[PDB]
Design a protein around this ligand. Structure first.
Ligand SMILES: CCCCCCCC/C=C\CCCCCCCC(=O)O[C@H](COC(=O)CCCCCCCCCCCCCCC)COP(=O)([O-])OCC[N+](C)(C)C
Ligand SMILES: CC(C)CCC[C@@H](C)[C@H]1CC[C@H]2[C@@H]3CC=C4C[C@@H](O)CC[C@]4(C)[C@H]3CC[C@]12C
Ligand SMILES: CC(C)CCC[C@@H](C)[C@H]1CC[C@H]2[C@@H]3CC=C4C[C@@H](O)CC[C@]4(C)[C@H]3CC[C@]12C
Ligand SMILES: N[C@]1(C(=O)O)C[C@@H]2CC[C@H]1C2
Lengths: 454, 52
């Protein structure tokens, strides 16, 4: 009954390049430039975030081939920090990180897909919410019917967005063939350039949620990482180079949608292709996140942190139906948010703190338990550099934003009530246990799902 | 902490549950087609953009 391994190297590369390339290179090129002030520093933070991602991702290839459980960051945290730290990690991802980031790339899909019906005015907000929801629902249904559907969908749209980024880079090369740094340099401000840039690289850790579903993890996990992130970094610096050949700083700082202005300038009567490809680029990422998000919660239920129905599988299709239906519904609740793009600050803070704790754990476990196998081992310097870097980024951004970060810690600490109630302190009237069981078997009867075995 | 595969197929294969599960599947899928019809209506009813 347990999930079949069927992710190849190519479908794992499609998961990473598909899920990273995403929205950030279309919706956020303005975001770094507004903090970095000039193309010479802006195009540099695009490379710097690439490097920090590459060394962090290789660090995840060591950690992943070491421990080889699925559930990624959460699993690797449980093997080092134990039950409560791992639960708080997962509770942040259950409530905010994987719901909000999915609804963020879904709103961008809806907005840029509809944009050629409404050039030079706002797209109707309620239609942009419905088409964001239609995307999440249809990709939940595809991801429930077959992993050989959802991986082919990932391949399809990972190809599509790289063709689109090739057009954008090519039109950049055409322009510079046809034929500077006034900078607001401040350590208290360049950090928000970096936090803007890294959001566009977020996803190098996503293949670590499907290690128990790849056909040969000890080869294909570390190979898919190191094939993927150099491609992403190259595509991103060349794409920014293209935007800065076409547009002035004042245009990019004041325009709502940089790829649309780029399209308008280069393609005229044919300009609608660029909006549609930004759409198709987001759609691929909603899939890659529903894929890897459902597997995280499935692992969190298997290892006893999350209610039992989420661990179950539909035996005729071998898809984790209750987990997909939950991560879907949890994403659609973000439709009741007005200024949802605000949550990218909370996303940026919460994510690299969890990766920091994971890589602190990578060093700690290699010293504390040296007998565990290391099918790839790279260095002891890359972990140390990544830890001091991410802890700098966290400490400095916290220091500049105590009012926002303070309320942020209440999201973290909201887990302790639920942890004690469900996991550990375990209030247990026998009527409550009879109700939880009755509710679970009712959900089994609806979805036709059976628990995971051996 | 629930039914095994054996215990599930001995209950949830009943024609009442099969018809219920068919109903939920088609209810969802007509609901999604309805939500797309709703979006296509809003996109037609919305004030079209000023020309330049
Ligand atoms: C909460 C309970 C769940 C209600 C939603 C309907 C569940 C239907 C169900 O049990 O599916 C089950 C599986 O799962 C699916 O068929 C995947 C699609 C399910 C819907 C996903 C998005 C839902 C939005 C949030 C139905 O199981 P089945 O009857 O064996 O499916 C037969 C399908 N063919 C072969 C006839 C095509
Ligand atoms: C969930 C996935 C498939 C996306 C759904 C998006 C839907 C709502 C979009 C995609 C393409 C859109 C259509 C594209 C072109 C036109 C012609 C125009 O004169 C009226 C609107 C109309 C008819 C649009 C209606 C809305 C539409 C059907
Ligand atoms: C079509 C049905 C079966 C999908 C299953 C989920 C249903 C129950 C609910 C969950 C959350 C809901 C969405 C939540 C918020 C909004 C924003 C509002 O401005 C338009 C409707 C819309 C977009 C809702 C549509 C229906 C919805 C998707
Ligand atoms: N790389 C992302 C993108 O689409 O740009 C940002 C969020 C993390 C994975 C996706 C969603």
């Amino acid at each position: 009954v347990t999930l079949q391994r069927n992710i190849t190297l190519l479908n794992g590369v499609a998961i990473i390049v598909g899920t990273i390339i995403g929205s950030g290179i279309f919706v956020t090129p303005t975001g770094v430039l507004k903090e970095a002030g000039s193309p010479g520093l802006a195009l540099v933070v695009w490379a710097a975030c690439g490097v920090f991602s590459i060394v962090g991702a290789l660090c995840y290839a060591e950690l992943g081939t070491t421990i080889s459980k699925s559930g990624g960051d959460y699993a690797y945290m449980l093997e080092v920090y134990g039950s409560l730290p791992a639960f708080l990690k997962l509770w942040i991802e259950l409530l905010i990180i994987r719901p909000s980031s999915q609804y963020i790339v879904a709103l961008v899909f809806a907005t840029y897909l509809l944009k050629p019906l409404f050039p030079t005015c706002p797209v109707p907000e309620e239609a942009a919410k419905l088409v964001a929801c239609l995307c999440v629902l249809l990709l939940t249904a595809v991801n429930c019917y077959s992993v050989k559907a959802a991986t082919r969908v990932q391949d399809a749209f990972a190809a599509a967005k790289l063709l689109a980024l090739a057009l954008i880079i090519l039109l950049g090369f055409v322009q510079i063939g046809k034929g500077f740094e006034g900078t607001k340099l401040d350590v208290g401000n360049i950090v928000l350039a970096l936090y803007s840039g890294l959001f566009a690289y977020g996803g190098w850790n996503y293949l670590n949620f499907v290690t128990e579903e790849m056909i040969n993890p000890y080869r294909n996990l570390p190979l898919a990482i190191i094939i993927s992130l150099p491609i992403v970094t190259l595509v991103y610096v060349l794409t920014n180079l293209a935007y800065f050949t076409t547009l002035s700083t004042e245009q990019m700082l004041s325009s709502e949608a940089v790829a649309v202005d780029f399209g308008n300038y280069h393609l005229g009567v044919m300009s609608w292709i660029i909006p549609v490809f930004v759409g198709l680029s987001c759609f691929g990422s909603v899939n890659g996140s529903l894929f890897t998000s459902s597997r995280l919660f499935f692992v969190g239920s298997r290892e006893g942190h999350l209610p039992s129905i989420l661990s179950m599988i539909h035996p005729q299709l071998l898809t984790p139906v209750p987990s997909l239906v939950f991560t879907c519904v949890m994403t659609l609740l973000y439709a009741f948010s007005k200024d949802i793009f605000s949550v990218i600050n909370f996303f940026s803070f919460f994510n690299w703190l969890c990766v920091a704790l994971a890589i602190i754990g990578m060093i700690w476990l290699r010293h504390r338990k040296p007998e565990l196998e290391r099918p790839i081992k790279v260095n002891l310097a890359l972990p140390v550099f990544f830890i001091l870097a991410c802890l700098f980024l966290i400490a400095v951004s916290f220091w500049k934003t105590p009012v926002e970060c303070g309320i942020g810690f209440t999201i973290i600490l909201s887990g302790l009530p639920v942890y004690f109630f469900g996991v550990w302190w375990k209030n247990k009237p026998k009527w409550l246990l009879q109700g939880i069981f009755s509710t679970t078997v009712l959900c089994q009867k609806l979805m036709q799902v059976v628990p995971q075995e051996t | 902490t629930g039914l095994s595969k054996e215990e599930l197929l001995k209950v949830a294969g009943s024609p009442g549950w099969v018809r219920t599960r068919w109903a939920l599947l088609l209810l969802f899928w007509l609901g999604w087609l309805g939500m797309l019809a709703g979006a296509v209506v809003i996109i037609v009813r919305a004030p079209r953009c000023r020309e330049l």
